[PDB]
């Protein structure tokens, strides 16, 4: 017996197999239904019993996935977000939680939830060179805004946000101004990367990636830095209050920051965000999706 | 197998404010999408709101955006629903369930409660 | 003994000087093993330095080092090549290189924690 069902076993793996790899095959051109970021790497191991042998993806901390279906409630069918990695099995929490303490009682050693749920495309938030709200900075980011618009038309969506989306003490601050309006902010944010256009925010209230840094909004920001107080000074003419931030802005650690736009020509510096996003653009339009 | 108990259901009154909570068996509960389902008599049930594994990221149906609010504490395997500014629209039976997968899809959900059943007198 | 990390790069350089130090790891290809460097100093505990991702694409550095050490590697030759510059006296110490375990599920935290790495070099001696 123990010979005769490992045969009838074998045969009925096989078929999964088939089918599992089928079904693959048909995610490639499917739309990505959701986005996470992780919080931890997984290696895949042959004991894993993964729907197809060797075609787990391998991940590592804070990277995103773009996940096209839920194959059964220990897998996923999705890819990272990178140049050429093409769709394969993610493991669900369900499935990540089973294998860490696999691995615990192995090596003989509540954990943070693995995945956080952001948008399918990170959105775009400028900060610098100094406070918003204010002529200098506010005629610069203009001009970086009307660049994107014209480099990237029909592939980029820019939109305003009013809403105090850092609130995303606090208590005190929700109470100045209303969590209703933030949260329906975030997921306007959040539906308008959907279909994985570019998106662009406005943000009114980001003047600092710390204040959008606990969020699982999970934005590219893009500093546009003057590296001369006395040229800030110079184009100004509140001042104080101007040459504060950008003096606290450059006190930033630069991994706070997912560009850096320090070049001394604004062209140049248009150059350099235009190469960042065409980069990340490939990295979530595959050539393999859109057939 | 996860069980899910749904509770705070009765009679409330337009304006007014009322939360529901769904306590979940199990250890994993961490390992769970939760979502908040609304059901009409003799319809299909509808989604409401889900929430995802850290509770960091939700996701509200348009009816209810700014009125509802999911929240949930991983401590106590407890998963809740604020609704304020009630109407008479809202009168349903409200379920609450867990998913592997990130969806508002009854489909792609893999255990529910039974239900707790919510009339707003207008 | 098949798994060995060979070290080479230490030795002596005055205050804001530069040192390149680097380890060859033999016996295994290692293509997802994280590699890291700790050091130890007389009296104080051993600390992480500074530790590189299987891939190449993530690098992570102690508080104290950020800025001023820089972490490299080439998996083809099975090479980490860590360029300290800027280097102050609390900077001197026995540095060895490490290689990370068969993680299957991992956090950034793994890359701190020496008890996490499965093999080790000797040790190569960096004073100020």
Same mark, same amino acid.
């Given at each position: 017996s123990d010979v005769s069902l490992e045969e009838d076993r074998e045969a009925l793996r096989k078929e999964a197999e088939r089918q599992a790899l089928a079904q693959l095959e048909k995610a490639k051109t499917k739309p990505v239904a959701f986005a996470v970021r992780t919080n931890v790497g997984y290696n895949p191991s042959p004991? %894993? $019993?993964?729907? #197809?042998?060797?075609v787990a993806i391998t991940f590592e901390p804070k990277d995103f996935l773009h996940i096209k279906e839920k194959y059964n409630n220990d897998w996923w069918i999705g890819r990272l977000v990178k140049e050429g990695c093409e769709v394969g099995f993610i493991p669900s929490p369900v499935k990540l939680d089973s294998l860490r303490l696999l691995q615990e009682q192995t090596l003989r050693q509540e954990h943070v939830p693995p995945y956080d749920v952001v948008p399918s495309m990170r959105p775009i938030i400028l900060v610098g060179p100094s406070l918003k709200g204010y002529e200098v900075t506010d005629m610069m980011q203009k001009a970086l805004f009307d660049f994107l618009k014209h480099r990237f038309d029909g592939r980029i969506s820019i939109t305003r946000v009013?809403? +105090?989306? /850092?609130?995303?003490?606090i208590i005190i601050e929700r109470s100045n101004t209303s969590l209703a309006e933030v949260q329906s902010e975030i997921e306007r944010i959040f539906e308008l990367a959907r279909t994985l256009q570019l998106v662009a925010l406005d943000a009114d209230?980001?003047?600092?990636p710390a204040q959008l840094?606990?969020? /699982?909004?999970?934005p590219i920001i893009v500093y546009i830095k003057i590296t001369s107080p006395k040229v800030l000074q110079r184009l100004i003419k509140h001042l104080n209050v101007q040459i504060a931030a950008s003096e606290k802005l450059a006190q930033?650690?630069? $991994?706070? @920051?997912?560009?850096?736009? +320090? $070049?001394?020509?604004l062209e140049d510096a248009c150059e350099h965000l235009a190469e960042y996003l065409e980069a990340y653009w490939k990295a979530t339009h595959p050539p393999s999706s859109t057939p | 197998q996860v069980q899910l108990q749904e509770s705070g259901g009765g009679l409330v009154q337009a304006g007014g404010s009322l939360r529901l909570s769904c306590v979940a068996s199990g250890?994993? @509960? /961490?390992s769970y999408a939760m979502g908040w389902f609304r059901q009409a008599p003799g319809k299909e049930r509808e989604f409401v709101a889900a929430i995802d594994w850290s509770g960091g990221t939700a996701s509200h149906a348009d009816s209810v955006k700014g009125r509802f609010t999911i929240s949930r504490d991983n401590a106590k395997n407890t998963v809740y629903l604020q609704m304020n500014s009630?109407?008479? $629209? %809202?009168?349903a039976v409200y379920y609450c369930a867990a998913s592997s997968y990130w969806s508002?899809? #009854?489909?792609?959900?893999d255990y529910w409660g039974q239900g707790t059943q919510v009339t707003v007198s207008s």
């Open positions: 004991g %894993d $019993e993964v729907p #197809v042998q060797g009013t809403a +105090d989306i /850092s609130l995303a003490h209230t980001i003047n600092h840094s606990k969020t /699982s909004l999970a930033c650690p630069p $991994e706070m @920051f997912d560009i850096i736009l +320090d $070049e001394n020509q | 250890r994993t @509960f /961490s009630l109407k008479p $629209e %809202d009168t508002r899809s #009854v489909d792609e959900y």
